[PDB]
Amino acid sequence: QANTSYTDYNVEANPDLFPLCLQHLNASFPDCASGPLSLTPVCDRSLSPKDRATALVSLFTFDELVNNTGNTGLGVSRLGLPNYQVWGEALHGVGRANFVESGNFSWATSFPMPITMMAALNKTLIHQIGTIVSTQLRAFSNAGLGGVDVYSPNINTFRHPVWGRGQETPGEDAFLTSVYGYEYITALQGGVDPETLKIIATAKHYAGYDIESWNNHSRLGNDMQITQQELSEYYTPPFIVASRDAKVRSVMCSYNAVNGVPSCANKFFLQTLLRDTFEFSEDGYVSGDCGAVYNVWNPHGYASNEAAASADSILAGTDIDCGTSYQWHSEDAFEDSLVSRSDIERGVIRLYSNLVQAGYFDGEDAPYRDITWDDVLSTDAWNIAYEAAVEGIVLLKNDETLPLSKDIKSVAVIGPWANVTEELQGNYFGPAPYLISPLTGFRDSGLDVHYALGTNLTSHSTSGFEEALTAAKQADAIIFAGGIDNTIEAEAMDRENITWPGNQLDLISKLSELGKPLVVLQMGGGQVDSSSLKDNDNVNALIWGGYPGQSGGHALADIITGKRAPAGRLVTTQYPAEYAEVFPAIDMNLRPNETSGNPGQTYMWYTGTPVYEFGHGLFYTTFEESTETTDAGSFNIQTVLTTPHSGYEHAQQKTLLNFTATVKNTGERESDYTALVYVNTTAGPAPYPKKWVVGFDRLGGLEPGDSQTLTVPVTVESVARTDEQGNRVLYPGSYELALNNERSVVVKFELKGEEAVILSWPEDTTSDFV
Amino acid sequence: QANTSYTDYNVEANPDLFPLCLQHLNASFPDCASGPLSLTPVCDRSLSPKDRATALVSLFTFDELVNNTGNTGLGVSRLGLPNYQVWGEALHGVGRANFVESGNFSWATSFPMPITMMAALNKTLIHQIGTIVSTQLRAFSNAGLGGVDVYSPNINTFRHPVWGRGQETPGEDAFLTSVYGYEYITALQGGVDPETLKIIATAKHYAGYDIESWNNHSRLGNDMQITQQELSEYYTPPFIVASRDAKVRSVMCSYNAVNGVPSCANKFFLQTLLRDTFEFSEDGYVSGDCGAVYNVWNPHGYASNEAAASADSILAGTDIDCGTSYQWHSEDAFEDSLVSRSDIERGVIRLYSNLVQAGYFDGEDAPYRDITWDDVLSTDAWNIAYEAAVEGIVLLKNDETLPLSKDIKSVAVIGPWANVTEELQGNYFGPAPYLISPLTGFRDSGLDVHYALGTNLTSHSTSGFEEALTAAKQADAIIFAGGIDNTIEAEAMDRENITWPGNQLDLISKLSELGKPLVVLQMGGGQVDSSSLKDNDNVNALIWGGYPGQSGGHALADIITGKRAPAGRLVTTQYPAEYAEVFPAIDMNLRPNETSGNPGQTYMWYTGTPVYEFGHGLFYTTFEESTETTDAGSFNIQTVLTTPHSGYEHAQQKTLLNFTATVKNTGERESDYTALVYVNTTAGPAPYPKKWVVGFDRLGGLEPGDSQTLTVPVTVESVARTDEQGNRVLYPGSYELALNNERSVVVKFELKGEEAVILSWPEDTTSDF
């Protein structure tokens, strides 16, 4: 929109937002004791949030209203209503507060990226990180340095491995991503529809959004073709959980179109599904992504100008524009009879219904107003950022080599990821209190360190190889730190292949020839094809370290020395290189299609051979896994659905059965234990998935010789399939539950009786109406 | 459904309901102190109604749930959840409680029918009647003789004069019917979204429902073709007001189809309009009319069988079935994958959310649990049923014969409506404490009364004429009581003409030849063509008495003797007879169509000459009306919509201007004064309405020589028209406001600027999908 020459947004994936949209605001609170609103209904705490917000908005002029329809809400000076910034961020830490240069409020805790947080398979960790982030956000708000809503979490799935924003997600699985959303959202908001909202969370990006730019296909003009079956079974479940179960107060509509219609103008998505099917809060608001309303016109061409784009997005259910479309074009829309004043008010009322419920109008003694800089210091000092990295690092390959023997006195630390700063933080980060590189972690370890760069991330020069081989020949062991970073994968920048960059694999190869223990760190969010390292017996160990955050280097060193033990697992598939060449990344069809050369997408459908599977991870000990009951027997679909469901809003939320096993540490070292529970079946119509996740857990601190019971509740809805119309359906037939990729424990069950619908999927009558 | 031989419901207008649907239930309250529910969340008074209702429904088995999807909810004995009857009625008084034969709870106050209540043009009267009905319903509830929801009020409009249920309505105008609805609903519920609901009201019948049976077109099979412009401008506003403004907690979906789709299976009506456009309560529930879900299958054929009818109605948003379709076919629908269990639960959760908000779970000290038989007696003793009849009687014709001069000592009281009982009550009534006929009113007046039947209502016999002509010759003055009743106009029985029945006009004609003062009472809800009486100089006076309720004869006699003075006005058009012969009553098009022989419908569009107009009524005095400012000047549409709107949810609810006039009693008797304020314009699309109502009021007790100020707020929304897509739009141009049919005061105003949409009408993408 603010471009200075011709810009084709069908190819360019970065919008050009106006400075008003990008402006940070100095935050403050309305004065309900003595200000102009003090004797008016918005300041009457006996009324509902909706009645208070409706009363406030009735006091505005139209010009005043329109100035508060965008993220940069200019306020209403006449009424003592402050400016209010909707555009906050908290992907993995406070991200878009008004950080000062130094001293108080100059930093916030930088956790690992979500892709690393999820690899821990610890739902309690995601919840605790959300509670700290929520506290830190409220500290910035009380200092005047931010608002009380954030555009987090990202609960899209990492469906295709090239995606430049997969790093922001909990991986490729809808079950894990749903649970991540639930934990992070309920932590941010301070409970499940609580008395006072702590931070308003925003589930994004709804929906069908998982490509930035691949092969020139800009997100801003992408029109993704998705079957109702796959929309219902895969592209929407995280949002169903966020809306129905976590009770999220905001959803962000995506830049892209689906089946012809931009999300923010998509009456089927916002009204028929989110509000009428997914039980979205009656007071919930939809934010457009930043420029997405403008994109309804340019470049989608769904509306013929920006005033018509604004009207179509408001009438579909986009309440707040991240942008300047509503602020600068809603008056023209009104004067051209495209919208009523009441239509424009509806979204601002919803926003302020949530600010009322967060205590914005309730004065200095309301909940969470007493959080200070000292609460940022004391929550950071818990070192949960370090704990998260320790739990989410994944061991892909090991012989005897890790943890390093007491005989290893010196390490050569080599490669582009060894000496780093902000690379540790991925994207959507604020300033950190410190950043510990892998180099620094080893320097702090008390091993002798010999550092050589060796090669840059994307280089075809061997200039630095000799210095690196020299360091390696004189050390007892070699740590090579490489992979990808946000110079390769970012917002508006998908990868065009899924191989290691530059000549990193060539230097690793030469390092493997020296007769020394060789440990490789594969960093970054997306996976790279490590088949050459898998196959090389002289590459002794391989770790995926993701984006490990402010304490990353200490976590990596502590795992490598065995001060801590790994138990993370991959939450995406590491595909072979050819996967990214053989079919278009914009093909949204999950099921294999030999005709189109689609081999099937994600661990659920892929018919090829991963380098390392979804759910792969190794330990510093051995486990023996067994169950008392390998055959859980039969359950009648009609019986399970027709008994009472005390404690659940819906019958299908009940536990169908517990997956239960005995896990014994039969090895030499204490370790945590991570478990994924997969279901597979021939029930329902072909084609059939290989399997799908129905549960997960992390057990803590199994000492050598000790046993712990694993108990994973498998719900009725977790084993439902999806019919060709998008209905969620329980089908009669044979099922198996399996522990991990190797299926160490298998529990069989049968569903008897007739098919039953558990979710009725509404017909899309709006997207193609004439 | 329960028919014993083949029944064609395309022609037959009465459903055959199963006895379970029709069964009255003994009412009781769940025990949240000591019963099985006491330790569960539905008995936790700290939670929301919705959370409490969701928690209750989660305790049920599916078979228990399904037994509570119909109006006759069987309860859940395991949980101590009582049976609960959703089918209550309170059209104009308690109507469907478990009345006992004699003594306490054997009767309730029987007010005039709505059509007579509205003719008073007294919005406070409608509210006060609702408050008394609400209090009497609560007395029956506390006695275990009723529930706490009613299928009232009827806020359809009396669009076509043949309709057998027009009597139940506030007349043909959408503004009046919207105000009636708002006042009666807020009175029933005990406020505007109050803390505790008093009685759950149900706006009915949504939508396009205004024909029973005319020319064998049964309501059960009728598929009414309505433009989006007329659906928005006329057939839905009373429901928009009921939902948005009165905050009604229930809507009843109608028997008929509109534009191919039965109302109860109509996603556009229930979801896109009522829920997504009209701000229906997030906890509100839709009831089908009694048998309506069954009719989605038989006879509409929208669904192929009763299970599919049930599933389509649930998915569209019909929460509760008045009938046995949900109770006896829901399980089949679930087992055939037509609905989920959550789909079936949604409607019962909505019903119980309202029952929780009415204090149903809150025990004997909850609000309204202290109302007893004492409160029926004390509210009845206020005599508001009498006052309503006095205020809603309409004087159509008079030459100073009324009120009767003191020289009249004897009256001949003749005709089929003289000696009556339940005729006074119209329909949807319970037992009354007493019923005063016109004959008893005159016997109580201290006039000497000579009674003669004269003729029966629908008679081809002159056998009683001689005895009536004799009584008339012997008396000083003749009162003829006639018209129509529920033997002519009823549910499942439209009129086939709009003329006086039998030979009543022949006997009046003969009585007009005797050189005595002659007063005719035209009784019943629909109008009959009284042109022969208008034109006969020897018919001295004509009164429209509607259905005037338990005290009706005292109200008529007190008007006629001048103990009270009439001020009511007609709330429907009295059309000439040929109006009911020249175009089909099932044509819903309001705008005149010369090709189809449609002359335009209602006072807003009719291009013919009424016998007596909508808004016509006479007084026992003369009034002089004037205003200081006849030109209120210009208003800019953008300016008016862009200033603040403090105290209003919507800008368009603001007053645009006040219509004000000085009204002086220039005559010799104290009188009330009634006013209709009409607007007319050349703004917006042709064709142009003749006029439409934007306001009304009733001033009280103007003594001779007394002046009062009439002040009627004209809101921005009241003068908005409707475009071809159904949007409510304010148009620039020239407007006139006019006091009454004679336009005694005219105030001009101009709107300037650009058209503005004040209500965006959503596209119907579902009806033809």
Ligand SMILES: *[C@@H]1O[C@H](CO)[C@@H](O[C@@H]2O[C@H](CO)[C@@H](O[C@@H]3O[C@H](CO[C@H]4O[C@H](CO[C@H]5O[C@H](CO)[C@@H](O)[C@H](O)[C@@H]5O[C@H]5O[C@H](CO)[C@@H](O)[C@H](O)[C@@H]5O)[C@@H](O)[C@H](O[C@H]5O[C@H](CO)[C@@H](O)[C@H](O)[C@@H]5O[C@H]5O[C@H](CO)[C@@H](O)[C@H](O)[C@@H]5O)[C@@H]4O)[C@@H](O)[C@H](O[C@H]4O[C@H](CO)[C@@H](O)[C@H](O)[C@@H]4O[C@H]4O[C@H](CO)[C@@H](O)[C@H](O)[C@@H]4O)[C@@H]3O)[C@H](O)[C@H]2NC(C)=O)[C@H](O)[C@H]1NC(C)=O
């Ligand atoms: C899956 O992920 C889980 C979640 O992350 C992992 O569980 C976490 O493990 C961490 C690492 O061990 C624990 O971190 C250490 O915490 C202690 C402080 O503990 C106290 O406070 C904790 C936080 O409390 C707040 O948040 C919770 C949870 O949301 C609330 O419930 C509280 O009310 C409180 O809320 C406030 O703040 C929030 C956020 O702003 C707001 O939202 C609220 O409104 C409030 O303002 C709390 O969790 C602890 O509670 C545990 O311990 C209690 C007994 O002490 C016990 O009653 C509780 O039941 C709970 O018990 C369970 O957990 C403990 C956990 O270890 C078990 O032992 C127990 O048996 C039960 O399972 C507690 O109240 C902190 O001091 C540590 O930091 C020091 O040590 C670390 C080591 O890593 C160093 O790096 C630091 O630098 C630091 O060093 C200082 O102190 C040293 C010792 O004194 C000293 O040596 C140094 O010099 C230096 O001064 C850690 O930060 C974490 O508590 C725990 N979280 C939870 C929820 O359990 C889980 O392990 C993981 N894996 C698996 C397999 O599950």
Ligand SMILES: *[C@@H]1O[C@H](CO)[C@@H](O[C@@H]2O[C@H](CO)[C@@H](O[C@@H]3O[C@H](CO[C@H]4O[C@H](CO[C@H]5O[C@H](CO)[C@@H](O)[C@H](O)[C@@H]5O[C@H]5O[C@H](CO)[C@@H](O)[C@H](O)[C@@H]5O)[C@@H](O)[C@H](O[C@H]5O[C@H](CO)[C@@H](O)[C@H](O)[C@@H]5O[C@H]5O[C@H](CO)[C@@H](O)[C@H](O)[C@@H]5O)[C@@H]4O)[C@@H](O)[C@H](O[C@H]4O[C@H](CO)[C@@H](O)[C@H](O)[C@@H]4O)[C@@H]3O)[C@H](O)[C@H]2NC(C)=O)[C@H](O)[C@H]1NC(C)=O
């Ligand atoms: C348009 O229609 C209007 C509404 O019907 C007409 O106004 C009505 O006129 C009638 C006839 O004159 C009059 O009837 C008399 O009422 C006498 C008792 O009055 C007191 O109580 C009533 C009822 O109170 C309850 O209801 C109202 C709400 O409707 C509520 O606000 C109260 O709190 C109370 O609630 C309780 O019951 C309800 C229902 O069950 C529950 O919901 C609730 O929980 C409670 O349990 C009040 O309305 C009266 O209020 C008037 O007087 C007070 C001050 O005294 C004023 O402050 C108030 O504004 C109002 O004033 C208006 O009316 C009075 C006359 O009453 C005028 O003087 C004044 O100028 C105003 O017009 C009282 O508090 C009752 O004793 C009397 O019965 C006796 O006479 C009859 C014959 O007439 C005999 O048969 C009897 O046996 C008795 O001997 C009679 O019933 C109504 O009170 C009045 N109603 C209202 C709402 O104003 C209006 O005339 C009409 N026409 C025009 C031109 O406007």
Ligand SMILES: *[C@@H]1O[C@H](CO)[C@@H](O[C@@H]2O[C@H](CO)[C@@H](O)[C@H](O)[C@H]2NC(C)=O)[C@H](O)[C@H]1NC(C)=O
């Ligand atoms: C679930 O997937 C597992 C793993 O592919 C299938 O395993 C086979 O089961 C049969 C017994 O029915 C054995 O004879 C084979 O040896 C098994 N193969 C493996 C790889 O273990 C299982 O059949 C699938 N179950 C369903 C119900 O779909």
Ligand SMILES: *[C@@H]1O[C@H](CO)[C@@H](O[C@@H]2O[C@H](CO)[C@@H](O)[C@H](O)[C@H]2NC(C)=O)[C@H](O)[C@H]1NC(C)=O
């Ligand atoms: C409002 O309606 C009145 C009719 O009541 C219109 O007044 C008539 O105007 C025409 C001019 O076209 C005259 O021929 C008639 O004599 C008028 N009749 C009466 C009874 O006054 C009036 O023009 C309409 N105004 C608008 C703005 O539509």
Ligand SMILES: *[C@@H]1O[C@H](CO)[C@@H](O)[C@H](O)[C@H]1NC(C)=O
């Ligand atoms: C910006 O790009 C658009 C096309 O996306 C174009 O129409 C417009 O002219 C450009 N603006 C400027 C100032 O170059």
Ligand SMILES: *[C@@H]1O[C@H](CO)[C@@H](O)[C@H](O)[C@H]1NC(C)=O
């Ligand atoms: C709207 O915001 C602009 C700045 O973007 C400001 O100059 C203008 O005064 C605001 N309008 C009103 C009515 O406050």
Ligand SMILES: *[C@@H]1O[C@H](CO)[C@@H](O)[C@H](O)[C@H]1NC(C)=O
């Ligand atoms: C910095 O923060 C600490 C802890 O909340 C506080 O004591 C100190 O007053 C702050 N400094 C200023 C300048 O406010």
Ligand SMILES: *[C@@H]1O[C@H](CO)[C@@H](O)[C@H](O)[C@H]1NC(C)=O
């Ligand atoms: C590490 O990188 C920093 C820049 O962050 C650079 O200044 C420093 O010289 C490098 N350290 C070594 C040992 O080369």
Ligand SMILES: *[C@@H]1O[C@H](CO)[C@@H](O)[C@H](O)[C@H]1NC(C)=O
């Ligand atoms: C690595 O990149 C830096 C920054 O461009 C450059 O100065 C340096 O020469 C490169 N080193 C090698 C070994 O290529």
Ligand SMILES: *[C@@H]1O[C@H](CO)[C@@H](O)[C@H](O)[C@H]1NC(C)=O
């Ligand atoms: C498989 O791909 C081919 C070639 O694009 C296409 O014609 C066919 O519709 C696809 N099948 C499905 C199930 O989408």
Ligand SMILES: *[C@@H]1O[C@H](CO)[C@@H](O)[C@H](O)[C@H]1NC(C)=O
């Ligand atoms: C599953 O295990 C949990 C935890 O022990 C238990 O409370 C629950 O009753 C079990 N559910 C079933 C179906 O066995």
Ligand SMILES: *[C@@H]1O[C@H](CO)[C@@H](O)[C@H](O)[C@H]1NC(C)=O
């Ligand atoms: C009732 O009438 C229907 C047609 O409406 C017919 O199908 C059915 O057989 C009748 N029932 C009986 C028992 O005659």
Ligand SMILES: *[C@@H]1O[C@H](CO)[C@@H](O)[C@H](O)[C@H]1NC(C)=O
């Ligand atoms: C209601 O109570 C009466 C009196 O005990 C009893 O005769 C009748 O069977 C009960 N049930 C119904 C359903 O009316």
Ligand SMILES: *[C@@H]1O[C@H](CO)[C@@H](O)[C@H](O)[C@H]1NC(C)=O
């Ligand atoms: C459902 O209602 C019938 C009566 O119509 C009754 O016999 C039956 O017991 C009820 N079912 C349950 C589960 O209560």
Ligand SMILES: *[C@@H]1O[C@H](CO)[C@@H](O)[C@H](O)[C@H]1NC(C)=O
């Ligand atoms: C009937 O009502 C009166 C209240 O007027 C009360 O005193 C009496 O006890 C009641 N009769 C019975 C038998 O309950």
Ligand SMILES: *[C@@H]1O[C@H](CO)[C@@H](O)[C@H](O)[C@H]1NC(C)=O
């Ligand atoms: C009036 O009708 C009643 C009830 O039909 C009848 O019993 C009575 O005799 C009639 N009165 C006269 C005066 O005919």
